[PDB]
C-alpha cells in the first residue's frame, strides 16, 4: 500500500498548479473554451478581476488584456489644409480598453 | 522526529526572505497576488514570501523634465525654445495604474502644451517679455 | 530591457542625464530617474562621437581582476 | 537560408520591420511576418550607417557566456 | 572565572565606542531610525547640537548636515536686457541651511 | 590557385557569376563555368564595396564551430 | 575616479598636463598639482588627436609580465 | 633583410614584380631575378592601395595547419 | 626614457634616423648617436604615414616563436 498512496500525491499537486492562474492588478484575463468563450448572465462574456481563478488544465485558455491607458504616437505625415498649405504634424492618442470582451472579439486575437 | 526537523527548515527561509527594508525616499506598495493590499510607510516591514510583493516608489525625490523643440510663433516666425520643468510624484496607486509610462506620456503632453502656448504669442514677445 | 534602436532615438532626443557602460551592457539612469538596460549590437565607430556632441554624461568602469 | 545580398536589396525596399543581431548570425523578421536567416560574411562599417538612415529597427543581443 | 569576566569587559568597550557619535561645531547631526527620523515635541524632528550623543549601535543612522554658509558661483551666461542687449555677467550667491530637517527631506540624501 | 590581384581585375569586368565567401579562402564562379581558388593577402576595406559597385552577388556562410 | 565626459571637457579647458596610459587607467594631473583617475568607456579614435592637439603630455607603459 | 623604409622607396618606383604575403612577413622577388625578405611592423591601410594603384602583381599564401 | 608626446616633437623636426617597432615598444636612434625608448599608448594610423613623409628609417623584426 506504498506505491498507491505515494502515486496520488504527486499527480494532484502538479494538476492544481496548472489550473491556478492569477490576474495582475493592471491586467484582466478572459477564460476561453475550446473554440468559444465562457458566458453567463444571458450570454455576457465574463472578465476576471485581479484575483485568483481556477481553470480546468489543458481545456481552458486565458487571454490577458491590459486595462491601462495605451499611448499611440503618429509619425510625421503630410496633410492638406483649406488653402492647400501642406503641413507636417506629429500627434499621439491615448485610449483605454472599455469592453475587454468586445475588443478581443472585434480585434480578433487581442493584438495591439 | 525527522519530520519535525524538515518543517523548521522551510519556515525560516519564508520569514528570512519575507523581511525587507524600504528606503526613506521610497514608499513600498505591498500587493496581493492579483490585488493590491496596502501602502507601507518607511521603515522595516514584513511581507510573506511568495504571497505578496512590495514595489518601492520614489515619493520624495524631485525629478526634472526639460521640454524643447522648434515651435511656431503667432507672427509666422520660428523660435527655438527650451524649457525646464521640475516635478515630483504622489500616491503610487494612481501613478502606477492610471496611464502607461506616465513620465514619458506627460512629456508628449508637455510638447503639445509648449507648442500651443508659443503659437499664441509672437516671436518678439517670447524672446524678452513672454518669458515670465 | 529596452531596444537599442529606441535607445538611439531616445539618445537623439536628449533624454539621458547619466550613462554607464560595462562590457557590452548599457545600464542607464536618465534625468527623470527612470532606468532601463540595453546591449550594444556590435562595435560602432561614431556612436561615441554623437554622444559627446550633445553633452551627455558617460562613465566607464575598471576591470574585475579574479582572486 | 536567405542570401546576405538579398537582405541588402530588401532593406533598400523598406520591407523589413525589425531584426535581431547575434554574433555573425542575422536572424530577422520582416514586415510580411516572414522569418529567415543570413550570415554576415565580413565586417561592414557603413552597414549601421545605412540601416539607421533607412529607419529600420535594430536591437542588440547580450554577450553570450557559457555558465 | 577568568574567561567569563575578561570576555564581558572587552566587548563592552567596543560597543560603547560604536554607540557614541559626536556632532562637529560646523556640523549638525539628525539621528535617524531604520527608515524614520527620531521625533519629539509633537512630531518635530530633533537635530543635535555640537556635543556628545549615544546611539544604539547598528540601529540608528546619522546624517551630518553642515551649518556653515555655502558659496555658489555662476559662470558666464547670456541674458537679454530690455533693449535686447546681450550681456555677460559673473555672479555668486551665498546661502545657509535654515531648516536642517527640511533640507534633508527636500534634498533627499542630504546632498548640497 | 590564382593571384589575388587577378581576381580584382576580372571582377572589374564582371567576370564572376556569384561570390560566396568563407574564412580567408574564396572560390570563383566565372561566367564560363570555370572554377579556381584565390587568397586574400590582408584585409581590404573597399573589397566588399567594390563587389557591390558592379551589382556582384554576395553570399554569406554559417560559422564552423568545432564538434 | 572621474567621469569620462567631465574629464574630456576639463581636458579641452586646458587644465591637464600629464597623462599615463596603462591599460584603461589614467593618472590625471591638473595644473594645480591635484591627482585623480579616469577610465575610458570604449575605443575613442579621436582621443589621441584631441589630447595632442591641445599640447598635452601623454605617456605609455610596458606590460607587467608575471614574474 | 631590407628595412621597411627602403622597401617603400623601391615599390614606389615600380621595380618589383611579385611579393609574398603572409602574417606580417614579406618575401620580395623583384624584377632583377633577386629575392630577399622584409617585414611589416604595424598595420597600414595604404599598402594594398599603393600596390593596386601602381598596378603591381601581388599574391599571398594560405596558412599552415598546426603540428 | 622619454615620453611619447616628446618623441613625436623630435620626429617633426627631422631629427630621428632609425626606429624599431616591437609590439607597443619602440627603440629610436637619432642623428646624434643617442638612444632611448618610448611607448605607443594607442594605435595611430597617421603615425607611420607621418614617419615616412619625414624619411625616418623604419625597420622590422621576425616573430619570437617559442621553441
Question: Keyphrases for this structure?
Answer:
part of a larger assembly, 9 chains, A: 112 residues, alpha+beta, two-stranded antiparallel ribbon, B: 132 residues, three-stranded antiparallel β-sheet, 4 helices, rod-shaped, ATP-dependent zinc metalloprotease FtsH (chains C, D, F, G, H, I), Protein HflK (chain B), Modulator of FtsH protease HflC (chains A, E)
If you had to describe this structure to a student in words, what would you say it looks like?
The structure is cut from a larger assembly and holds two copies of chain A (112 residues), one copy of chain B (132 residues) and six copies of chain C (67 residues). With 112 residues, chain A is an alpha+beta fold. Chain A has helices at 3-19, 100-106, and strands spanning 20-22, 27-32, 52-54, 61-66, 70-80, 86-95. Chain A contains two helices and six strands, in the order H-E-E-E-E-E-E-H. In chain A, strand 5 (70-80) and strand 6 form a beta hairpin. Chain B has a domain at 63-132. Chain C has two helices and four strands. In chain C, a hairpin with a 5-residue loop joins strand 2 and strand 3 (35-39). Chains in contact: A-B, B-C, B-E, C-D, C-G, D-F, F-H, G-I, H-I. At the H-I interface, helix 1 of H face helix 2 and strand 4 of I. Chains C, D, F, G, H, I: This is ATP-dependent zinc metalloprotease FtsH. Chains C, D, F, G, H, I: It comes from Escherichia coli. Chains C, D, F, G, H, I: Belongs to the AAA ATPase family. In the central section; belongs to the AAA ATPase family.
Q: Would you report the number of β strands of chain C?
A: 4
In what order do the strands lie side by side in the largest sheet of chain B? Answer: 4-3-6
Question: Percent helix among the residues of chain B?
Answer: 25-40%
Number of helices of chain B: 4
Largest sheet of chain B: 3 strands, antiparallel
Rg estimate of chain B, integer Å: 25 Å
Q: How many extended strands of chain B?
A: 9
> How many structural domains of chain C?
1
Treating each run of at least 4 consecutive H or I residues as one helix, how many helices of chain C? 2
The major β-sheet of chain C equals: 4 strands, mixed
Taking strands numbered 1, 2, ... along the chain, how are they ordered across the largest sheet of chain C? 3-2-1-4
Q: Give the CA-CA distance, first to last residue of chain C.
A: 31 Å
Overall radius of gyration of chain C: 12 Å
Label the overall shape of chain C.
globular
- Give me the strand/helix succession of chain C: HEEEHE
**Whole-Å distance between the termini of chain B?**
79 Å
GO molecular function (chains A, E): hydrolase activity
Function (chains A, E): HflC and HflK help govern the stability of phage lambda cII protein, and thereby control the lysogenization frequency of phage lambda. HflKC inhibits the SecY-degrading activity of FtsH, possibly helping quality control of integral membrane proteins.
Protein name (chains A, E): Modulator of FtsH protease HflC
Subcellular location (chains A, E): Membrane
Amino acid at each position: 500500500m506504498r506505491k498507491s498512496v505515494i502515486a496520488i500525491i504527486i499527480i494532484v499537486l502538479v494538476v492544481l498548479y496548472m489550473s491556478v492562474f492569477v490576474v495582475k492588478e493592471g491586467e484582466r484575463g478572459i477564460t476561453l473554451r475550446f473554440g468559444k468563450v465562457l458566458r453567463d448572465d444571458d450570454n455576457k462574456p465574463l472578465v476576471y478581476e485581479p484575483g485568483l481563478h481556477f481553470k480546468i488544465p489543458f481545456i481552458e485558455t486565458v487571454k490577458m488584456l491590459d486595462a491601462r491607458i495605451q499611448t499611440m504616437d503618429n509619425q510625421a505625415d503630410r496633410f492638406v489644409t483649406k488653402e492647400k498649405k501642406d503641413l507636417i504634424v506629429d500627434s499621439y492618442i491615448k485610449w483605454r480598453i472599455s469592453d475587454f470582451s468586445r475588443y478581443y472579439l472585434a480585434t480578433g486575437g487581442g493584438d495591439i | 522526529r525527522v519530520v519535525t526537523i524538515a518543517a523548521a527548515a522551510i519556515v525560516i527561509i519564508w520569514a528570512a526572505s519575507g523581511f525587507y527594508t524600504i528606503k526613506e525616499a521610497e514608499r513600498g506598495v505591498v500587493t496581493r497576488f492579483g490585488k493590491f493590499s496596502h501602502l507601507v510607510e518607511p521603515g522595516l516591514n514584513w511581507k510573506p514570501t511568495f504571497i505578496d510583493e512590495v514595489k518601492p516608489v520614489n515619493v520624495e525625490a524631485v525629478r526634472e523634465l526639460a521640454a524643447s523643440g522648434v515651435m511656431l510663433t503667432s507672427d509666422e516666425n520660428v523660435v527655438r525654445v527650451e524649457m525646464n520643468v521640475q516635478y515630483r510624484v504622489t500616491n503610487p496607486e494612481k501613478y502606477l495604474y492610471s496611464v502607461t509610462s506616465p513620465d514619458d506620456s506627460l512629456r508628449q503632453a508637455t510638447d503639445s502644451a509648449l507648442r500651443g502656448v508659443i503659437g499664441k504669442y509672437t516671436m518678439d514677445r517670447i524672446l524678452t517679455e513672454g518669458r515670465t | 530591457k529596452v531596444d537599442y534602436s529606441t535607445f538611439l532615438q531616445e539618445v537623439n532626443n536628449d533624454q539621458v542625464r547619466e550613462a554607464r557602460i560595462n562590457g557590452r551592457e548599457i545600464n542607464v539612469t536618465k534625468k527623470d530617474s527612470n532606468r532601463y538596460t540595453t546591449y550594444i549590437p556590435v562595435q560602432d565607430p561614431k556612436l561615441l562621437d554623437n554622444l559627446l556632441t550633445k553633452n551627455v554624461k558617460v562613465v566607464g568602469e575598471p576591470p574585475e581582476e579574479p582572486s
